[PDB]
Design an enzyme around this catalytic site. Structure first.
Site, mmCIF file in Angstrom:
data_model
loop_
_atom_site.group_PDB
_atom_site.id
_atom_site.type_symbol
_atom_site.label_atom_id
_atom_site.label_comp_id
_atom_site.label_asym_id
_atom_site.label_seq_id
_atom_site.Cartn_x
_atom_site.Cartn_y
_atom_site.Cartn_z
ATOM 1 N N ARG B 178 0.840 -1.192 0.000
ATOM 2 C CA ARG B 178 0.000 0.000 0.000
ATOM 3 C C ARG B 178 0.879 1.247 0.000
ATOM 4 N NH1 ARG B 178 -4.743 -2.573 -0.947
ATOM 5 N NH2 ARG B 178 -3.276 -2.463 -2.716
HETATM 6 C C1 LIG Z 1 -4.032 3.840 0.494
HETATM 7 C C2 LIG Z 1 -4.938 2.614 0.311
HETATM 8 N N1 LIG Z 1 -5.731 2.175 1.399
HETATM 9 C C3 LIG Z 1 -6.593 1.062 1.257
HETATM 10 C C4 LIG Z 1 -6.625 0.372 0.026
HETATM 11 C C5 LIG Z 1 -7.510 -0.835 -0.192
HETATM 12 O O1 LIG Z 1 -8.275 -1.226 0.906
HETATM 13 P P1 LIG Z 1 -7.800 -2.655 1.459
HETATM 14 O O2 LIG Z 1 -6.208 -2.730 1.501
HETATM 15 O O3 LIG Z 1 -8.393 -2.951 2.905
HETATM 16 O O4 LIG Z 1 -8.327 -3.749 0.441
HETATM 17 C C6 LIG Z 1 -5.810 0.778 -1.070
HETATM 18 C C7 LIG Z 1 -5.873 -0.020 -2.419
HETATM 19 O O5 LIG Z 1 -5.200 0.343 -3.422
HETATM 20 C C8 LIG Z 1 -4.970 1.905 -0.934
HETATM 21 O O6 LIG Z 1 -4.197 2.323 -2.013
#
Ligand SMILES: Cc1ncc(COP(=O)(O)O)c(C=O)c1O
Ligand SMILES: Cc1cc2nc3c(=O)[nH]c(=O)nc-3n(C[C@H](O)[C@H](O)[C@H](O)COP(=O)(O)O)c2cc1C
Ligand SMILES: Cc1cc2nc3c(=O)[nH]c(=O)nc-3n(C[C@H](O)[C@H](O)[C@H](O)COP(=O)(O)O)c2cc1C
Ligand SMILES: Cc1ncc(COP(=O)(O)O)c(C=O)c1O
EC number: 1.4.3.5
Lengths: 199, 199
Positions: B178
């Site tokens: 991420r």
């Molecule tokens: C900054 C960020 N937070 C959350 C997510 C996705 O949510 P999760 O990791 O719980 O599937 C992403 C997905 O690209 C992201 O870029």
């Protein structure tokens, strides 16, 4: 084949579920990906993609860092727009609504369901702030991976989510000659008023 | 492989051209498709996809019906956001700027370069207004196809375009854990200031 009023469901979520279902079926990349638009204090709109994680009559949910730009913007103006860029399927779904914070209970539940590396990552990034180098992110990550030992990887206080209410939902489907089908579902006190819009 | 500051071009359009080029190369559906966000008089943001038709240092251009909702909204608040949903390529390009109307000369030139059925279609739709049935669009189309005989198919007075200036351009590229790469180019009086943003 087309989109005729007579074939529309009373509840827009019903049509959205169908469109979401077929989108997964066609294996589009990130079918749950939607562009969320917010507005800053000067009237300037901002956009970024986030993932829809849950939806029901109460609205659509996504999670984000509470110190981010979108968060700051939502705290000053809760009006947001969501758009699902499904044009490879000649479709679009746009939602108009107000964003409200999710409770701690809801957030903990979803947070602990994410891959550990992602949970640790959540801890790492001061989302949207300017940082001098990528290495800052990488050192912290490593540092925390071992700090936790992973015993349970804690929920960051700066991590949360928003639920966007359904005030309006617009469905768009490609039409020849540029004559596309557009239907706007509009909340009328619990009930939904439907109007076709010129393309 | 990643996105490091040291590899960034001075002019953001240079990076955008490269990303646009590779997007066409990967055969994404509608690589020139971008989500444009505008804001109404109450602070509510709205979104819809449009196609980028030209770009240069002066800004990005798209054409639309001058009686549409986006047009009405731009006339009251020219601040807009554009976002290219290139996530199947693990990328995003977001532009912040002000929208200005294109001149008649520019519009005629692009208008007559479109497929005739599209030119006729342009005449047909009172874009964004509520219409009682799809048939209204279909009768008019037929009616006009023969009305013109196509001698040259006239430029509708309600048809035009906008050029969005480049005040800020943000590049996003997928990162593991991420931890994505984000760089924000910001106009500083002709010159561009670059900052990496936490993901
Ligand atoms: C900054 C960020 N937070 C959350 C997510 C996705 O949510 P999760 O990791 O719980 O599937 C992403 C997905 O690209 C992201 O870029
Ligand atoms: C396919 C995809 C999914 C994403 N999902 C989320 C998400 O669920 N939550 C989040 O905070 N950021 C997500 N992002 C990153 C955002 O687009 C954005 O960079 C980040 O939230 C910071 O935006 P802000 O600076 O406007 O606050 C995602 C990006 C892509 C391309
Ligand atoms: C792939 C794609 C390309 C589109 N390009 C344009 C465009 O260039 N100009 C336009 O006016 N509408 C375009 N549309 C339709 C818009 O999304 C929208 O329905 C229309 O402009 C009316 O928006 P408004 O009611 O917000 O004004 C396109 C839709 C898709 C899915
Ligand atoms: C309403 C509308 N106008 C214009 C366009 C595209 O511009 P052009 O037909 O000149 O390629 C589209 C493409 O989907 C559209 O839906």
């Amino acid at each position: 084949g087309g989109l005729r009023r007579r074939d529309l469901p009373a509840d827009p979520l019903t049509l959205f579920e169908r469109w979401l279902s077929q989108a997964c079926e066609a294996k589009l990349a990130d079918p749950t990906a939607m562009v969320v638009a917010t507005v800053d204090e000067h009237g300037q709109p901002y956009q970024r993609i986030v993932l829809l994680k849950h939806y029901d009559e109460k609205g659509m949910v996504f999670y984000t860092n509470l110190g981010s730009r979108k968060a700051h913007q939502i705290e000053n103006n809760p009006r947001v727009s969501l758009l699902f860029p499904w044009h490879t399927l000649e479709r679009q779904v746009m939602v108009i609504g107000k964003a409200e914070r999710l409770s701690t209970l809801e957030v903990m539940k979803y947070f602990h369901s994410r891959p550990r590396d992602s949970q640790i990552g959540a801890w790492v990034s001061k989302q949207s702030s300017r940082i001098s180098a990528r290495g800052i992110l990488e050192s912290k990550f490593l540092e925390l991976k071992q700090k936790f030992q992973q015993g349970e990887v804690p929920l960051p206080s700066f991590w949360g989510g928003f639920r966007v209410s359904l005030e309006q939902i617009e469905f768009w489907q490609g039409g020849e000659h540029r004559l596309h089908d557009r239907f706007l579902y509009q909340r009328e006190n619990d009930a939904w008023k439907i109007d076709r819009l010129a393309p």
